[PDB]
């Protein structure tokens, strides 16, 4: 029974507790106790004394009495009463002749773990499965004694050490003998094992540092209860093992177990930093190297991990390098390494540099070289955005001021080379508000003076536009720049010393700033000298000055413009003259828009509030002008024949003015009240004819957009877009200028204003009905009685139709229905009528055929001629109330005829039309003849002398 | 910022260190420094300073100051820096106005936790949800204060005193203040708990038993230290808390709770059963009526599982009253629940409860009466065959001996009143060897002989023949019983005082006993004087003394023979006159084996060794003696029937001996070399034929055997069964007792071996031919000269047939056979044969025809007259070499003529077979009939007289 043999052997113990036994006896005396498992609650006591007289034995057994895997299970089956077999194996080869409820095997398990708890078994077994003794480790390394090591630091050994720290019996460190001594030894063990395992070497190394953070884990908080040198043996512990490391893997790997030490310990930066500030440098080199290259590469999912591990490793050697006292060595830090940091896009980095430099030049003051020496490696790198942080790095205003100077020459030459990519980042950098506010706040006058002179030299030296205007915009931002001390002019002409004739050059510049890039508060008008001595100005400067002469009214502008142009002769009298009733320039404005409207073209007016344009004139003070208005009506007529190309789906300038102002003067107008529908059926459908021969004449391009601008056909109006809404808008607001008193402007008869008032009155379609029945009214006024009041009208319409027949498919057209509406009212004509009102009804028929002159007969088509030819013959064919129309028509003829005989031009079948002449003179020679003879012998005399 | 403000707290603290402020403040600075997670390590050492402070400030709060919910994160969050979210719901809520990595989180924590170890507030905090102070509980049930309690035993409360014991501040249980006072009194606490929850109910006690079960498992190694008095205190606790259990159930979990304890706490059984023995037999009713219960009855698989808890309950508590001193407890636990306890099937309680019965006899005399009714209400249950246990419980040499005999009256009354279990139950308790050994070292001489006496009784009184064998063999055992004091006669016939004609009726008992029951090493033969006094015996005691005859014949048997019989008056004469020359024994047991062998029965000799028979008789030394071997031809002979009914497929004694006698000398004998073809087939089908009609005359069962037995009709020999080769084999075996001389035994002629070798000689079939050689030689040892040899031969063969053709399907086919070998033979007849040659080669013809008496003509089928008609008849034929065949047999029915007149029997056609003599006269007178005048007057006198 196994259970009479151990306690026999219990006995043999106690009897003989006073004696040593062999190390093998005692281990197979504790095998065979263990293995028992019939224990009974009576003998416990007498066979926990015997083991804990067997532990105090063994304790005191030598080192090497045992080797490790044998040293392993008889701790197993004391402290948890686990039997390894091979351990049962073993241990059943000794003879022990000559020494001869699991409820108390448990409780003999717990009883046997406690007493070697109190014996401190944990530090023998450590000392003999390492094969060394701590306690004369940690002194020998407490005395920096490193050739004498003597320690086994093999992986599997590490791997048996992790194996032990996790159980129970650490839970309770601070309860075994000396735990501040046994876990100084251990901590320097630990740091021994590392020690050997880097010289062994001269996969390696991570069971050393698993292990070693492991025990640091457990090993905190007694490591600094007794030893207060522990810190600084740690200290020199590594400033050696980082000196040993062969490869940059390693080093940041080591480096990172004392971030972790430094965390642990409670060792602060400052300590650190002053004691290992040497090493730290080239620690610090080839880490930042390992994070360049991780950045330019930037089981394959490694390389994204120990990236961060790294730069981490950094963010924290710089946050022990806070205080870094030496100058000079993060001087050369930023010299060298601080560009590539930037570039390897981290911030955190980069930013506690910066603070560490700023804290280093407030308590030292770095010499000036250096520092122009950084920015200028900065400002030679493309990064020129983060700059001004080292600017306010910059704790000497002197030096401060000469690094502004030099950073402001310095992307002045990146923009002068013309690299895009260098633009580019000058134009991210005066994106932001901070970084003017920083340069007000450090500059001095004198600076702004000579960036202003640089900046308007490279403005004028640009030939790129958006460079310029980038120029000129930031020259007015360094204009109105507020200084804090100062606390506004800032460049003045003087000062920029160059020629007039480039100065005027930048008015277009400054328009493209003031109304394209900026807004309207911070718009900055300015006005070079070219403007302000000259009325022949482009359309944009023009544009600018009528938009932005209300800022000279304000005491400001003209005080800003005085000063800024001071010590140039004559200032004086250029403002009084622009002061000066400008009314030219008003004119000349006006024009230029109207012929604008006149082409179907874009222009950035149009962009502007241009609905309220009498509001502008309003703004001056020239709306009572009165030779604007004139200008005005044509302002009118402009937009009306705009509208009419916008009907008629045409658009492009391949017709003439007056060819579509007579065409929209054709239009829905009362003139056509008087026509027939077979009439409306031909002219439609020749000017549906024309307008798709105009149309296929056309390109693809042109076609597409006028399908898709086009829902419908003649004479459906096309879609209505945006602009034409406002261009309208303000047509019909003229009005607004257009009540000049009550009659006396318009009564006279000779006018431009007359003929638009003229056409406004019967049926021009743009107009709204309010001003038709105001322009009625007051043609009510010049006209009381209406029997007038339509024969003048009618008069108008066709004198129109025949003057726009002067300077040529749509001619012929014209000419029939000319043709025709005479044919229509020749049923209207009474017996008694006169010749000169049968003229009238005709158009300006008599003022018409008697105009004789050299340009008159030159390059005609013999339009007069073809007129009196066409309706003779029609007259001659009805002779061949119809009485009463020929005998008006003869008289009107016989009245005229001494006239045409000068119109026959030298160029066209002259002869034919004077053969043809014959039908006039018969129904002339039907009744007349008596009353009128001279004019007829003087007619036949210049036709005879035309053979 | 959080930390800001911690940090102003933290410096108010170290201010105010001496000052006292309210718990709410203190657990709001403690939550707003918790909260904070940017910690820095340089000013962690501040902090920690500043809780240790606030924790020393905190365990001196009242513990009314909190509440338990409130209590509990703020110990979360201090120990391991978990923060409740309510927590912080309620904590937010307070103003602080007037107080203003995560490794130093966790180092805080770390930190936290050790100094809350130090100051103890676990202690705090279960005073705290528990509503008690737990020194004062502790001193107060000390002192055994049970009316002043005051705790709060909820189940909750319970539910967080768990939740709690598992974090690792309680893996250090030896390093808070006063470890082992404060152990006792959460041991106090709890047991108080267990109280409380017990008295409140006069599911309501599982969490109180959980937690309780839990703190004494990880708190026994330390409760021990300091008090002493532990013990004697849960002694009382419990010796209360059992006695205020309502149920039975309860009581079952609690006496578990406490054999754990007593585990635990190291309580041997001697102490607890001497300080609790009174409430124990109380619980120990219970809980046995538990079993009872549950064993009975032996979601629904619980009521196993319990089962086993509750009998390792009463494995614990009789280990508990292992040393129970009071004698009179364990007598009455034996006579009132051992009997149901055994009834239980269980063996482990019953066995313990025997050796603390043992051993309180050992130390204790127990009245003789107390053990005579433990005894007796065992005796009275079923279970008779562990009472051999208590009997050896039994430590009294005279309650011993009454007791077996008290024991052995009950099984024999057991026996007596004729129940079938109690039988059965006898019979297993006498199948075991120690309880005979046990009888033999306990019982006394006097007790063997009432046994015997009562046994011899009981025997003789049992109907039933398997309870007498039973008694007469377990007689037998006793009679041999060896008595270890005395070392053998055990029983005396004088004792038995029975009379001798009921002990003659032992006899087949002791024939079953000694041969049936028991082996050959162990049979006990013994033979009553009916035996031994008598010849006229059943075969059953026939064969016994034949085969246990040896056994007087050692000195051993005729010792024990005249001991056993001592005082009776002629044994020895009786034993001379059986060791005189049993030779009538021979021939009666002999006799009844031939008959038994010539019937085709079944009989227990088959299974006996009788193949080597003839060693038998050599064993008595009677094999020389003459008058045996007489029986034995005879033995041959019957087996010789046998075999026939083994090769017709008859079987059964449907007919008699002398038939299937004849039948067999019928066989493959040289008499059928004579015969041909045709008359082997008219022989055959006609044997077919009839033992087909025997066939279908049988029963279904019978038939069913037969065919299953039979692979082939006839002539094939069926299948041969095992028995069939023992009894041939035994068969010609006999020849070892036929050596008999050289010539002299056979030359007696007329004599039953004579005609045996005769049969032997020629052509029996179950003899091999070693024995028909041997045989053939013996003759021709007998007869030198070979043609008497063949003519004795054919003789015997014809009279055979002739004679067995006198007592009787089967007749009259011997009747055509006779005649046909007749026919065969009358070709063979020389024409100077004799009279009385021709005779004999018809057989026994002239002394067979000659045989006039009232017996024979008695009842006679008139076969004589049968078959000289039938012969005569076919002569006739042939008369109407033939003529030396009739002259032949006309000679021989000369001679015998004057002899058939005696045969006619009155019943038959006596008249028709006297007219039908005409034949036979005719033949005679064709000669002869000058020679034979006088045969011839003589015949037809009586012819006329039969008138």
């Known amino acids: 029974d196994p259970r009479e043999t151990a306690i026999g052997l219990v006995r043999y113990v106690t009897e003989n507790a006073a004696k040593d036994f062999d190390g093998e006896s005692i281990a197979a005396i504790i095998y065979r106790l263990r293995v028992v498992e019939n224990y009974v609650s009576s003998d416990v006591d007498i066979i926990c004394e015997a083991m804990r007289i067997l532990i105090k034995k063994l304790v005191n057994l030598p080192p090497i009495t045992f080797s490790p895997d044998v040293w392993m299970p008889i701790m197993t089956s004391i402290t948890e009463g686990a039997i390894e077999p091979q351990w049962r194996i ?75 720290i996790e159980k129970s019996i650490f839970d309770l460190f601070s309860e075994m003998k000396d735990h501040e001594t046994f876990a100084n030894e251990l901590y320097y063990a630990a740091l021994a094992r590392i020690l050997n395992n880097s010289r062994r070497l001269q996969s390696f190394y991570e069971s050393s540092l698993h292990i070693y953070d492991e025990l640091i884990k457990k090993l905190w908080p007694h490591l600094s209860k007794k030893d207060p040198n522990v810190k600084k043996n740690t200290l020199i512990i590594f400033e050696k093992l980082i000196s040993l490391s062969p490869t940059d893997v390693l080093v940041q790997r080591i480096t990172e177990k004392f971030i972790d030490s430094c965390e642990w310990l409670k060792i602060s930066g400052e300590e650190i930093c002053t004691s290992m500030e040497p090493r730290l440098w080239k620690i610090v080199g080839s880490l930042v190297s390992r994070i360049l290259d991780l950045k330019k590469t930037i089981f394959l999912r490694h390389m994204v991990d120990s990236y961060f591990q790294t730069r981490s490793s950094l963010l924290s050697i710089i946050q022990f390098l806070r205080t870094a006292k030496s100058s000079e060595e993060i001087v050369q830090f930023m010299r060298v390494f601080y560009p590539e940091l930037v570039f390897g896009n981290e911030t955190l980095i980069t930013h506690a540099a910066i603070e560490m430099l700023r804290e280093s030049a407030s308590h030292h003051s770095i010499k000036a070289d250096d520092f122009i020496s950084i920015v200028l490696s900065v400002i030679d790198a493309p990064a020129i955005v983060r700059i001004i942080d080292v600017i306010s790095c910059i704790k000497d205003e002197k030096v401060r001021k000469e690094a502004v100077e030099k950073t402001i020459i310095r992307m002045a030459n990146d923009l002068e080379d013309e690299d895009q990519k260098r633009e ?71 000062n920029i ?35 302000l001595e000259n009325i022949d100005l482009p359309m944009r ?48 404005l006006l024009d230029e828009f109207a012929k604008i409207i006149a082409i179907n073209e874009k222009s950035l007016i149009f962009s502007l509030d241009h609905e309220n344009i009498l509001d502008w004139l309003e703004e001056i003070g020239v709306l009572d002008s009165p030779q604007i208005t004139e200008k005005l009506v044509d302002i009118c007529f402009s937009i009306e024949v705009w509208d009419v190309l916008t009907l008629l789906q045409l658009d492009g300038p391949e017709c003439h003015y007056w060819d579509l102002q007579m065409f929209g003067r054709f239009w829905k107008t009362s003139l056509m009240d008087l026509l027939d529908e077979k009439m409306m059926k031909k002219v439609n459908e020749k000017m549906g004819s024309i307008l798709k021969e105009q149309y296929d004449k056309q390109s693809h391009v042109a076609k ?27 047509h019909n607001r003229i009005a607004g200028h257009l009540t000049k008193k009550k009659v006396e402007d318009f009564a006279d008869e000779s006018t431009q204003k007359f003929t638009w008032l003229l056409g406004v009155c019967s049926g021009q379609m743009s107009y709204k009905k309010e001003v038709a029945v105001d322009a009625e009214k007051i043609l009510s006024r010049l006209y009381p009685d209406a029997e007038k009041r339509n024969e003048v009208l009618y008069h108008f319409g066709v004198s129109s139709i ?53 340009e008159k007969r030159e390059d005609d088509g013999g339009f007069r001629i073809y007129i009196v030819l066409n309706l003779s013959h029609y007259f001659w064919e009805l002779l061949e109330h119809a009485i009463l129309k020929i005998r008006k028509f003869a008289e009107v003829l016989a009245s005229i005829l001494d006239k045409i005989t000068f119109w026959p031009n030298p160029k066209l079948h002259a002869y034919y039309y004077i053969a043809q002449f014959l039908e006039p003179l018969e129904t002339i020679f039907h009744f007349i003849a008596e009353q009128n003879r001279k004019v007829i012998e003087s007619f036949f005399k210049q036709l005879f002398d035309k053979l």
Chains 1, 2 share one sequence.
């Open 541 to 588: 400067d023009l544009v600018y000055v009528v938009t932005q002469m209300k800022f000279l009214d304000t005491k400001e502008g003209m005080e800003l413009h005085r000063k800024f142009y001071d010590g140039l002769p004559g200032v004086n009298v250029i403002f009084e003259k622009f002061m000066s009733k400008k009314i030219e320039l008003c004119m000349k």
């Open 497 to 531: 010393k160059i020629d007039l004739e480039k100065w005027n050059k930048m008015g277009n510049i400054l328009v493209e700033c003031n109304m394209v890039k900026r807004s309207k508060s911070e718009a900055l008008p300015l006005f070079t000298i070219h403007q």
């Open 704 to 730: 597409a957009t006028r399908e898709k601008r086009s829902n419908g056909k003649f004479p459906n109006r096309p879609k209505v877009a945006d602009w034409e809404e406002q261009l309208l808008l303000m």
């Open 90 to 164: 073993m241990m059943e080869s000794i003879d022990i002749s000559k020494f001869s409820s699991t409820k108390c095997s448990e409780q003999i398990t717990s009883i046997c773990k406690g007493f070697a708890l109190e014996f401190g078994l944990t530090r023998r077994l450590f000392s003999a499965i390492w094969n060394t003794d701590l306690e004369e480790t940690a002194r020998k390394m407490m005395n920096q004694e490193w050739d004498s090591v003597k320690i086994d630091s093999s992986p599997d050994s590490a791997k048996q050490a992790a194996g032990l």
């Open 424 to 494: 580019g980042y000058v134009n991210h950098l005066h994106e932001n508000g901070s970084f003017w506010n920083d340069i007000a706040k450090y500059a001095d006058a004198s600076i702004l003076d000579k960036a202003g002179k640089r900046f308007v030299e490279v403005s004028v030296d640009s030939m790129d536009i958006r460079s310029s205007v980038l120029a000129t915009d930031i020259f007015l931002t360094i204009l109105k720049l507020k200084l804090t001390s100062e606390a506004i002019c800032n460049v003045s002409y003087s």
């Open 802 to 854: 025949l003057k726009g027949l002067d300077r040529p498919s749509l001619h012929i057209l014209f000419m029939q229905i000319y043709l025709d509406l005479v044919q229509i009212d020749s049923k209207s004509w009474k017996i008694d009528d006169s010749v000169q009102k049968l003229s009238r009804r005709l158009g300006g028929f008599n003022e018409w055929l008697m105009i004789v002159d050299e």
